[PDB]
Copies of this chain bind each other. A is one copy, B any other.
Amino acid sequence: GPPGPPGPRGDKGETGERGPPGPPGPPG
């Protein structure tokens, strides 16, 4: 018979890593 239709799109990827910590503030 004719081929089946395509499967559904895959799941969305995992969330990216949180950014790294900011540098120290200005001297006081």
Please list the residues of chain A having a beta carbon within 8 angstroms of any beta carbon in chain B.
1-28
B residues near A5, Cβ cutoff 8 Å: 3-4, 6-7
B residues near A23, Cβ cutoff 8 Å: 18, 21-22, 24-25
A21 in complex: contacting residue of B1, B2, B14, B24, CB < 8 Å: B24
Chain copies in the assembled complex: 3
Query: Could you tell me the distance between the alpha carbons of A1 and B1 in the complex, rounded to whole angstroms?
Result: 4
A24 in complex: contacting residue of B3, B17, B28, CB < 8 Å: B28
Q: Which 3 A-B pairs have the closest CB atoms?
A: A13-B16, A25-B28, A13-B13
- Knowing A3-B5, A6-B4, A7-B5 touch, does A21 contact B25 (C-beta < 8 A)? yes
